[PDB]
Amino acid sequence: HMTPIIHLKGDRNSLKCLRYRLRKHSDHYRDISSTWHWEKTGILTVTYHSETQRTKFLNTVAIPDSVQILVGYMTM
């Protein structure tokens, strides 16, 4: 299905720590990936069960300025 996601892009280390933090302290997401890349820059994919969950996530989960938030969709 074409799933709503967001990709968090930035420093690989900043992202690894953000992933731990998301996992330990935050709600409003279905799954989150390991840090990956297509090198000091990376990507973290977060999936949602709906557009409303993704919106709740973006209205309440603190994400660092240095990490870019790209909203989007992908087949999974």
Place this chain on the structure above:
Amino acid sequence: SHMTPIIHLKGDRNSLKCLRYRLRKHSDHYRDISSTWHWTKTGILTVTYHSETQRTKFLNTVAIPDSVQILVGYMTM
């Protein structure tokens, strides 16, 4: 953002790492290819293409083992 054609390959991480190294040799047939990742072993490789033409080519010349699940789809970017 545009809907980009892709395929995900899912399977054993070793399998995927080997296949990914092979593929890196046939880079003509795809746009990009990710490092191996997983949902937080069952790894995943994402391959991107600049057209459905190029994807269909890829799928017609590349050999994928049966234990590696091919998932065709798209993603925005």
